């Protein structure tokens, strides 16, 4: 009721000292407290931990928490108990007499929370014992580890699928900081969360302004940006190679801005040197690769595209941990993107991994190539949905020049619907062009009314119109990289909504060498 909500608040105040719920917490709490399942996505420091702790206390019985991290579980228990919350940890390095003092406290219903290493949890009899205990809920922390594409991975987290089969009646909560569009499908498979609500909260950072542009002579381009907009300011400037980092630094010092290289082949010495000369003093600039601390950074500059949307989110987020406005500045070139693809084409990685890695690359480029608000594109990749344009990005503020492909979009959307939402971008494009592949013949797709219906255009165009549909969320990729129309597809199909491309991409043509 509202009498549940009131109840939770009096807990929020009296225990964690927090005044009010951040982002979607209060929904999650009331969702789980009432018996519901949940997927929770929040960035690090976002406030996950009490998403499960608060329901544990509101429901009769004990919240059961699983995380791979033992040392942090020990600390999270301690702090909980000093704050007046009855918590315990159980793992197999406890003396057997301790493991029983805790096991019996569970069964008597004496614990608000019990933190359990997956090692112990997965053991039947830890399983069986739980069925005899007054359990309020399960919380699978670091929930992403269930996924091979998951940031981290463990055999043991795949096995937590047991929780849903052995305890279907009881609420299950998964929380992870880092999830792409599907590592998430795996979380949802494994833990049987596919019908549960999904919550994302803290990903946005409203005080950072995002800008992307192409590269012609980037050093001057950067130098000019610092210059006008951040002369006495601290900033990070990111490059792929160790080589670029040191040129960029030598060069920036040659123009007498105070700049320093930072990277793994700096002797220890110099690393700590650069570190506090950057932290202590204001208006100093670090040139880093992928590598730490700083409160007030004004600008992050990317002289290269990162290898993922994740990396880019991380590095730009180093700006502005003051609520005070900051800018993220990036310049890329298609030249580069082509190199990344061939360097990943010639690799020795498995074909399953190349498809996924090229996936991340497309998402990254398409993010660059946005004809619509950049903050929506960025946030969508992590599952956050921003209703309206931010007014804080380079697309919002200085709208680029766009071409209207809304009718082409409809052809693409309808092609994939009518083909049963399972087929991939290369394949679909074969359809709208009219190409009869020996793989197009296998599905009889050539006999459909949507075949060659897009013949007016070429491959490069459909592939990009495809990329955009995915990126804006009009398309979703199921497997194995095959594409679904979404609930959002209707916007383009009822219309009222358009699919734009940057006039920037298209250009008078043809390319030449
Ligand atoms: N509802 C809230 N309102 C204000 N501050 C919060 C709120 N929830 C969490 N925080 C803060 O930010 C931190 C979140 O980190 P924690 O919840 O401890 O683990 P995680 O990094 O997984 O979220 C908290 O410890 C607390 O300092
Ligand atoms: Zn915007």
Author numbering: 5 to 295, 300 to 521
Please give sentences taken from the publication describing this entry:
RecQ helicases are a family of DNA strand-separating enzymes conserved from bacteria to humans that play a crucial role in the maintenance of genome stability. The helicase catalytic core is crucial for the ATPase and DNA-unwinding activities of these RecQ proteins. To better understand the structural and functional relationships of DrRecQ, we present crystal structures of the minimal helicase catalytic core from DrRecQ and its binary complex with ADP. The helicase catalytic core of DrRecQ contains four domains assembled in a trilobed or Y-shaped manner, with major clefts on its surface.
The apoenzyme structure was subsequently used to solve the binary complex structure with ADP at resolution of 2.90 Å. The nucleotide-binding pocket surrounded by conserved motifs is located at the D1 domain. Although we initially tried to model ATP into the experiment map, the γ-phosphate cannot fit well, suggesting that the ATP has been hydrolyzed to ADP during crystallization despite not adding a magnesium ion. ADP is bound with extensive interactions with the protein. The adenine moiety is sandwiched between Arg26 and Tyr22. The N6 and N7 atoms of the adenine ring are hydrogen-bonded to the side chain of Gln29, and the N6 atom is also situated within hydrogen-bonding distance of the main chain carbonyl oxygen atoms of Ala24. The ribosyl moiety is anchored via hydrogen bonds with the C-2 hydroxyl group of the side chain of Tyr22. The diphosphate is bound by backbone amides of motif I. ADP binding to the D1 domain causes slight alterations in motif I. The sequence alignment shows that motifs 0 (amino acids 16–29) and I (amino acids 45–53) are highly conserved in three RecQ proteins. Surprisingly, superposition of the apoenzyme against the binary complex reveals that the WH domain is positioned at a different orientation in these two structures, indicating the flexibility of the WH domain interdomain. The distinct domain orientation also indicates the interdomain flexibility of the WH domain. This motion generates a closed conformation in the binary complex structure and slightly enlarges the cleft between Zn-binding and WH domains in the apoform structure.
